[PDB]
Homo-oligomer: A and B are copies of this chain.
Amino acid sequence: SGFRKMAFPSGKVEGCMVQVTCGTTTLNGLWLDDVVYCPRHVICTSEDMLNPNYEDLLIRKSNHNFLVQAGNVQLRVIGHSMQNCVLKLKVDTANPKTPKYKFVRIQPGQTFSVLACYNGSPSGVYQCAMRPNFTIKGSFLNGSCGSVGFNIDYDCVSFCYMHHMELPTGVHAGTDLEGNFYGPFVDRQTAQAAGTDTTITVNVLAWLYAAVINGDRWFLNRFTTTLNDFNLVAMKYNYEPLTQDHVDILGPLSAQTGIAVLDMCASLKELLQNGMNGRTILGSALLEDEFTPFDVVRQC
């Protein structure tokens, strides 16, 4: 009983964060071998943000307008280029603490750790999932732009996210490390509306399969359902539809246990209509949707 959200150890990322200053704007950077990646709106003032002409602004900058600074050691920017929504500052010195790394683009429903920094200086680390509306629900105060998100597989850090914007309703938007935004958002101070946030159905089902394995058995029922009927009910509760791909991913979980996936779907349908009735499932009072099937199938 008890399945708490753990974040990856952050040491390998801590030695890569730096501070980038252009004019009066300062944000965070990512120092890998000889390149500093940072959001391209570092070259903007506040009234450039409404309608920024990024090509007009960049062509007027020189290498000496970029102050990059790792702790107290000043790096000299030696050339620069722009890939989509990120700026790449190439420096004279390679980072001696570069880990083995990789750039991956993730899909909604996937989890990762975020390292929040304020001036090339880490402050805290937490675990999150990217919501189906391509936003992340974190704590990002002013000056956290450039914070990255990552997973660690053995010794390989997989960078998947870089914070760019906060949206008016409190949530945050960003790009991959190749400069492509997740979702329909842009790096303008425009009226940008995130879509409806929906619960990640396949994550909840994987969590419920973990409960059966660790002893919790009270929510099960004798009924089964079709994939079509379940999706008609789930959408009334703002749950993401389930695909045949999701069913096969849950297969090993339905093999360790005896409960078929559509069998577990009937129980979830019952939970939504009745509620918890003040009981718990693995120490949690809510159906909780930020554990992926992959994480469950291993730590099982």
Give the B-binding residues of A (Cβ under 8 A).
1-12, 14-15, 115-116, 122-126, 128, 137-139, 169-170, 283, 285-286, 299
Contacts and interface: CB of A to CB of B under 8 A. Distances in A.
Nearest to A171: B2
A147 to B, nearest CB: 12
Given A1-B169, A1-B170, A286-B285, A139 B299 contact: yes
Contacts of A124: 6-9, 299
Contact of A137 (B4, B9, B15, B125): B4
Contact of A126 (B6, B10, B14, B139): B6
Given A1-B170, A3-B139, A283-B170, A125 B9 contact: yes
A189 B127 CA distance: 34
Contacts of A138: 2, 4
Contacts of A1: 169-170
A163 to B, nearest CB: 13
Interface centre among A3, A6, A169 (most CB of B within 10 A): A6
Contacts of A128: 4
A233 to B, nearest CB: 20
A14 B139 CA distance: 24
A118 to B, nearest CB: 11
Given A1-B170, A137-B283, A116 B6 contact: yes
Contacts of A6: 116, 123-126, 139
13 contacts: A1-B170, A4-B139, A6-B124, A7-B7, A7-B124, A7-B126, A9-B123, A10-B10, A10-B125, A124-B299, A137-B283, A285-B285, A285-B286
Contact of A2 (B8, B137, B285): B137
Contact of A10 (B2, B3, B9, B283): B9
A122 B170 CA distance: 32
A1 to B, nearest CB: 4
